[PDB]
Symmetry: C3
Subunit: 221 residues, 3 copies
């Protein structure tokens, strides 16, 4: 089917994706009400079940749900709507992996606003999305047509900080492979200082051109 | 309140915005009917008052308007609606600062077309918007979720020339800080021919990656 | 009107445009039923007329069709609609030059599936459009307000491979001029490998920043 075949090719296998999600488990260990927004193939739900974490996944796509319903708890719904259908101080944790980029930028404030209200204190929200602050990924953001406009890390940090969240931190992941990045220079005949400045320019070039392809913003309370 | 805090953080303080607008005073010197489209926090209006320049601002934001009315002459209203309500050859000059990137693309032509019709002969029009022709700047263009498509300066120049405006000029401001830009190499030991070509390349790299963050297009009649 | 002056200014002369599409002719030689989608100023029509290749053009623009009807066979209509009015396995070939970016993302798939149906075995389809994998050309992409999201070469390749086309090749054209790109270094006072590595860094830079401005995806069957 279209989207499975699509993700499989440009996102990677479920094993691959699940491997990447491992890093975020510490923020949900032993949680009882973790919401997986836009769960898709249910890679996070599978992980959760494995780590002994209770969670529900939501997804507007009917096929992602047929895909997860058998092993996991999922509700075919619009996230914002589903969030309104929830009591305040309900939710335990919230995972939003590669979802916001697929969301109408106009409704971004309301989503996180609802998350704050439906989350109980000392809870963590994790938002993982493609990094548009590096040319390489920015270019690749256009491969998926269902993508809206790139979602900048700073806009996410600003909104949820404004909403009340604290500890807001930004982490970058999946960097470009060696072959793609520019190479640094060495020499025992060329001026150390000429060498030094050229490499700093290459570090700057590598950061803005071939920087990490993803990022994750984490917040608490 | 949201948008003030947002502007303060990403667009700068009022004092700063006001500072950067002094470059346009020569174009509205002694004018009495200047329209400030998307007046925002009123920085351009505050500048006009100090310069004895009469102007009125318009904005869709009731929050921005409430902030300005007790200070300057503003009117809550869509720009196109306001323009349409003016007689032709009425305005002394027009200022459009960081507005077009928020306007729906299909309404850009009309807006500008109306400016031409409602402007009297000899008047000046200034349009400042974030520069998308430089990477650093193109990335920051996505921080604001209310942004539409990046507005290229050549496209505006085309529209203006087409409407009958003349002496159209595109200038660029808000250069990137040397800390972020790549550095030119100074060297007494390496061949000048080689150093020269490396610095000319750094020059091209800096213009397309760390060039001016803003641009302004100025026209007349 | 607007669009003629606009293309003339930003795309180039009919002469120039004609010169660029000339390389796709071998795919439609001897053909009698080629479909040129979004014929524009009929530069592809004109070429086929010169090669004994029979083809019809379609466009949604009144003025573009008006420009053509004199020397070429064209019809004013939505491309999706024209295709549906044809029998399956009818077309000798399909040319889509600088059109997919002017199209609603959610209709792209329909369009291509229709092309597949309406084409007969072993026919060629060529899709030429702006290349967004190079900074230079994606910046210029925003000059045209009517442009939607950029269309990445890989997305087009995935869609039609999905539909059943094979031998899908992605090619790139219209490199930037030597004066715009970064120049390479050559000297004999500097260590060979220092020069070799800086140059391959330049090669990587020129690729992602000043590379091909156009891409053509070619498929058969």
């Amino acid at each position: 089917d279209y989207y499975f075949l699509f993700e499989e090719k440009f996102r990677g296998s479920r094993e691959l994706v699940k491997a990447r999600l491992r890093r975020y488990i510490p923020y949900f260990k032993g949680c009882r009400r973790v919401l997986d927004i836009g769960c898709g193939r249910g890679e996070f739900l599978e992980l959760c079940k494995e780590e002994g974490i209770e969670s529900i996944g939501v997804d507007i796509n009917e096929d992602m749900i047929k895909f997860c319903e058998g092993k996991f708890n999922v509700v075919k719904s619009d996230a914002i709507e589903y969030l309104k259908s929830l009591p305040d101080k309900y939710l335990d944790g919230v995972m939003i992996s590669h979802f916001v980029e697929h969301l109408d930028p106009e409704r971004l404030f309301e989503l996180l606003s609802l998350c704050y209200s439906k989350m109980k204190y000392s809870s963590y929200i994790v938002i993982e999305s493609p990094n548009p602050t590096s040319l390489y990924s920015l270019i690749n953001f256009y491969i998926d047509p269902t993508h809206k406009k790139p979602v900048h890390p700073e806009t996410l940090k600003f909104i949820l900080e404004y909403l009340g969240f604290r500890d807001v931190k930004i982490e970058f992941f999946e960097e470009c492979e060696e072959l793609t990045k520019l190479a640094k220079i060495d020499s025992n005949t060329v001026s150390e200082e000429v060498i030094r400045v050229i490499n700093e320019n290459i570090e700057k070039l590598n950061r803005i051109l071939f920087g990490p392809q993803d990022y994750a913003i984490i917040a608490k309370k």
